[PDB]
Amino acid sequence: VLEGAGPGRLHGRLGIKPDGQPGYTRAPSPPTDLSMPQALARGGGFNLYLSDHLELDRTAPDARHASCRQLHYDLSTLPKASVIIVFYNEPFSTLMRSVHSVLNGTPPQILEELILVDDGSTLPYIREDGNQQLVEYLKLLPAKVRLIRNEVRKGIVGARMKGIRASRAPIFAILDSHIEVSPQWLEPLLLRIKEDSRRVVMPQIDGIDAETFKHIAGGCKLGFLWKLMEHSYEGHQTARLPPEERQPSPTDFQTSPAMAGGLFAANKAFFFDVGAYDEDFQFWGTENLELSFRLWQCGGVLECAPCSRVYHIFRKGGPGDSITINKMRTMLWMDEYADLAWRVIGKPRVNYRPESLEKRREWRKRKGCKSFRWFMENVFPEGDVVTLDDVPYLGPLRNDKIGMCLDNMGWASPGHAVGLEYCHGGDTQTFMFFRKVGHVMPVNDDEACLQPSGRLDWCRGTAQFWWDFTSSGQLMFRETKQCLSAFGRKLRMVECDDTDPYQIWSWTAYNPPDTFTFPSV
Ligand SMILES: O=c1ccn([C@@H]2O[C@H](COP(=O)(O)OP(=O)(O)O)[C@@H](O)[C@H]2O)c(=O)[nH]1
Ligand SMILES: [Mn+2]
């Protein structure tokens, strides 16, 4: 039951005790002699001295465009929804604030429940063998709110699964454990899925500083890099969209090849029929790109909602064998393109659970999921590699005259010079070519682009990174029409003369198979 309800306290006044004083004892203002690096250290990314001093009913600004406030929903016609917050060792202030923001900002008749999932927390206030601070504080919240636990820590997929299974409503929404909503955040999501159950709709994300906690606005279309992480459409990538979509209205829903994180809503039935999540994914990793490829390919639709805004606390501080498994398993959905991605993350040989993954290959064909080439040709044709014929060359860039190859000289990360070293055949000495934008990059970072300076730097789809690889073997920078020379084991730009053997290179052609055979375990 809701006691004292009203605008901004849609579920009533939360956290009050029998005697009327609040059930949370807020903290004093952070000390004046307060070293920010130590505070983010002891807070796991946040300034917890401040969060503990801020109110759990903190009032946030409306990050929604003005046109979003001019819409009217009918809360009787909308399907109830289960919000699912999953947390591992989230502090009390941030966690309880996220919950307050949801209950205060979600009409109760469209919020079936609010499920808090303990993914094996090891803190006294969240542990069943300790303070019991969380358990006792929950008794001061609506009945909608129920806690459930994982015996041990199962990770992102494992805990969202425990949470989604427990839901009751037709629709479930997933929220982080360190967030604040803007008003009317859930109404747009319910309305969009009511009209088509196949749609997974995600809110657009604003920020909360992890040092000052100032609210900050934020950015819909998202692609992916061949290192297998989401990547917001670069400027030259929106320029390929149709004109009618290059600059979309701030109230319209627009699609997205990928989802950035795990803040989305979906119909529980459709979600379970479209594959749900790969429960052999380990801890935190590439689940976002494997749920995104699978959704689109198996008759789904992914779009963001500019009228559905949620604030998130991006951190400023703090396994490894897990992120490479999640990536190999994501390649199932990439078909022949998995060769390229496999090479970019370093030809990794791991135990990707080949048994369960073959039962995901069976499931994939039983549903008749569309190919990854379908994906690239119809969902992400703005990308730079829509077919593997767009990667004409992958291998060493060798200069026969001096008998040396290029070398990232250690790392592929942007911002450091390239060198000429004796050829040894390792990935450090392998480079790829993207022809749609003329990018000479190290195979291990498709965000790193060679420049006439001889230095790698961040890739931009522009003329300052465009290279032509001529048929004589030259690396001609398009804007100056000068060619690259290895003279004196130094890299300088010179006049183009196909008779100059110091500027003529050899680059391995890239003709991968039509099917990718996974690397043995
Ligand atoms: O084992 C885990 C890993 C993550 N999460 C939650 O999943 C969400 C996304 O993870 P997080 O934001 O911590 O990842 P990050 O971006 O910090 O690496 C957050 O609400 C986490 O608390 C969780 O409950 N258990
Ligand atoms: Mn987060």
TrEMBL record:
Binding-site residues for UDP 2, renumbered to this chain: V86, Y88, D119, R153, D176, S177, W284, R315
Positions with a binding annotation for N-acetyl-alpha-D-galactosamine: E230, H231, S232
Residue ranges of every copy of the Galactosyltransferase C-terminal domain listed in the record: 256-314
Ricin B lectin domain ranges (all copies): 395-505
Record EC number: 2.4.1.41
Residue numbers binding Mn(2+) 1: D176, H178, H312
Complete-protein stretch covered: 101 to 628 of 635
Keyword Repressor on entry: no
Binding site for N-acetyl-D-galactosamine: E230, H231, S232
GO cellular component, one term: Golgi membrane
Gene Ontology BP, a term: protein O-linked glycosylation
Residues bound to Mn(2+) 3: H416
Membrane topology label: Single-pass type II membrane protein
An MF annotation (GO) of this entry: carbohydrate binding
Domain Glycosyltransferase 2-like: 82-213
Positions annotated to bind UDP 1: V86, D119, R153, S177, R315
Residues reported to bind Mn(2+) 2: H231, E234
Disulphide bridges, residue numbers: C68-C307, C220-C304, C298-C369, C405-C423, C449-C459, C483-C496
Domain of life: Eukaryota
Enzyme class: transferase
Entry protein name: Glycosyl transferase
Assigned protein family: Belongs to the glycosyltransferase 2 family. GalNAc-T subfamily.
Broad class of the protein's primary localization: Golgi
Compartments (UniProt record): Golgi apparatus membrane
Residues holding UDP 3: V86, Y88, D119, R153, S177, W284, R315
Key words, A-Z: Disulfide bond, Glycosyltransferase, Golgi apparatus, Lectin, Membrane, Metal-binding, Nucleotide-binding, Signal-anchor, Transferase, Transmembrane, Transmembrane helix
Region (Disordered) location: 10-32
